[PDB]
Amino acid sequence: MLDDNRPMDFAKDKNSATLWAKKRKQVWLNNLSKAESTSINNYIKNSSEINSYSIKKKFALDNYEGIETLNEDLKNISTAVKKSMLTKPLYVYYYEANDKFGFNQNLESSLDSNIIDEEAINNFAKKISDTNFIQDGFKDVTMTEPDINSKLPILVHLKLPTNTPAASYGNDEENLRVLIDQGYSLKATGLSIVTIKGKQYAKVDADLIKQLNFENDVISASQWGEENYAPWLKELTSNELRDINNYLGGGYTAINKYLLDGTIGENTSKEDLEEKISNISSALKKRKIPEDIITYRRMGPNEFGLDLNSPDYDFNKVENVSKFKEKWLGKTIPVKTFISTTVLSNNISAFAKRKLILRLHLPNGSNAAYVSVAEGYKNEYEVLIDHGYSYKIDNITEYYDESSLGGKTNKLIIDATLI
Numbered sequence: 143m144l145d146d147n148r149p150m151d152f153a154k155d156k157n158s159a160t161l162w163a164k165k166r167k168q169v170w171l172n173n174l175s176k177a178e179s180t181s182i183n184n185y186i187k188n189s190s191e192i193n194s195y196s197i198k199k200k201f202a203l204d205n206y207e208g209i210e211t212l213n214e215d216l217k218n219i220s221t222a223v224k225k226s227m228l229t230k231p232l233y234v235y236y237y238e239a240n241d242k243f244g245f246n247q248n249l250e251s252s253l254d255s256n257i258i259d260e261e262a263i264n265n266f267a268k269k270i271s272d273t274n275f276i277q278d279g280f281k282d283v284t285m286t287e288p289d290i291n292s293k294l295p296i297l298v299h300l301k302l303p304t305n306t307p308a309a310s311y312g313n314d315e316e317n318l319r320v321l322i323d324q325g326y327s328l329k330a331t332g333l334s335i336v337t338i339k340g341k342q343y344a345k346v347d348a349d350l351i352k353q354l355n356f357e358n359d360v361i362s363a364s365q366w367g368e369e370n371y372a373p374w375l376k377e378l379t380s381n382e383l384r385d386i387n388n389y390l391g392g393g394y395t396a397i398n399k400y401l402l403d404g405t406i407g408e409n410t411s412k413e414d415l416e417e418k419i420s421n422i423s424s425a426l427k428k429r430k431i432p433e434d435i436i437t438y439r440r441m442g443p444n445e446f447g448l449d450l451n452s453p454d455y456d457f458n459k460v461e462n463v464s465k466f467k468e469k470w471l472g473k474t475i476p477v478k479t480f481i482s483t484t485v486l487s488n489n490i491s492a493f494a495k496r497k498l499i500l501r502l503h504l505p506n507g508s509n510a511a512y513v514s515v516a517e518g519y520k521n522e523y524e525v526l527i528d529h530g531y532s533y534k535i536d537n538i539t540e541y542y543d544e545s546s547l548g549g550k551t552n553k554l555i556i557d558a559t560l561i
């Protein structure tokens with residue numbers, strides 16, 4: 143009933159927005175447990191901290207103890223907002239920075255700050271296409287088109303679909319916000335210029351979408367792998383099973399080295415390497431990825447032309463992160479190797495100090511397989527991708543890995559799309 147008297151979009155009608163928000167906010171708060179009420183209050187005070195913590199937690203090693211009251215806040219805010227699901231779509235609004243679209247060109251004209259640069263917004267149009275922008279943490283937004291200046295260049299007009307957990311909350315009863323649950327992504331649906339208080343903003347129309355992304359959920363991940371690739375495993379030829387297992391047991395070193403630049407160990411031959419590559423690649427064409435999925439990879443510095451001791455690889459310094467972002471944002475990188483990925487975001491002990499974390503949109507139809515169906519229960523939840531694809535670099539987002547075992551260093555989350 144709480145959506146019976148409202149449009150999908152309040153537009154500029156703040157009075158109708160407030161009437162709607164006040165009623166559902168009251169119902170919602172009374173349905174919260176004490177723990178949920180506390181965590182929502184914690185979000186009002188410490189939202190930046192909670193959202194930043196959620197990133198550290200999802201990319202940490204398994205033995206990460208973390209901060210127990212923030213662990214509680216992550217759980218309780220999520221169960222809280224799930225008590226307030228929309229019954230019809232709701233359009234929402236927020237100003238946004240360049241960085242959240244992986245865009246590093248100024249959209250302001252050089253000659254007039256009120257005016258958007260035509261060439262920049264043309265490049266922006268290409269950059270936001272063909273991309274699902276993962277939204278980390280919880281996202282809070284406003285109900286009406288802002289009537290105030292922003293230092294930010296972009297206005298997002300975001301369509302939340304029916305059944306989105308989206309709770310009315312906040313301390314200003316006349317400007318109540320909307321708190322969106324974790325786990326969503328943004329998909330642009332249109333681009334235009336909007337003028338607000340005499341100044342032009344790039345207006346991104348977008349849908350809120352939910353991509354399959356297991357993060358730390360080992361139970362769901364292994365179930366998905368079993369369901370979708372147990373038959374794949376049984377139908378492998380003997381050689382395909384053999385050379386898949388060779389690769390996964392340590393043959394990757396020689397196989398991917400050869401695919402990268404033709405290196406041949408002394409005791410092997412080109413023809414034996416070609417054979418293994420042919421059987422693995424044939425196996426990976428047998429069952430295309432059945433739905434869009436996010437997978438992960440702890441990447442070594444050579445995958446971006448860097449060496450372990452390169453000064454440019456020290457992301458603890460600001461200028462190196464800026465250099466890396468300038469070099470790779472928006473680029474397409476061909477990948478000659480097979481790509482070993484995992485459906486879990488957890489850091490991996492053998493790779494704990496690698497500083498580059500691939501977060502890969504792996505499309506429906508990709509030649510890849512959940513290969514861990516073959517191993518025993520000590521497995522790494524792996525999706526192996528065929529050689530010869532490319533990465534489209536969508537975003538680069540730093541976070542600080544404080545852990546001794548992680549290397550006490552900034553690391554870069556590289557959001558990419560497989561092409």
Ligand SMILES: NC(=O)C1=CN([C@@H]2O[C@H](COP(=O)(O)OP(=O)(O)OC[C@H]3O[C@@H](n4cnc5c(N)ncnc54)[C@H](O)[C@@H]3O)[C@@H](O)[C@H]2O)C=CC1
Pocket residue numbers: 389390391392394395398399402438439440441442443444445446477478479480482483484490493522524
């Ligand atoms: N790295 C990861 O996140 C995951 C790896 N595994 C498994 O661990 C084992 C070893 O994994 P990796 O060390 O990652 O094998 P790998 O052959 O991909 O990489 C080994 C070394 O070669 C570099 N390298 C790989 N591809 C490159 C490319 N196109 N260009 C330049 N340098 C490249 C890497 O940075 C690394 O230093 C495999 O069985 C693999 O399936 C399992 C879960 C995910």
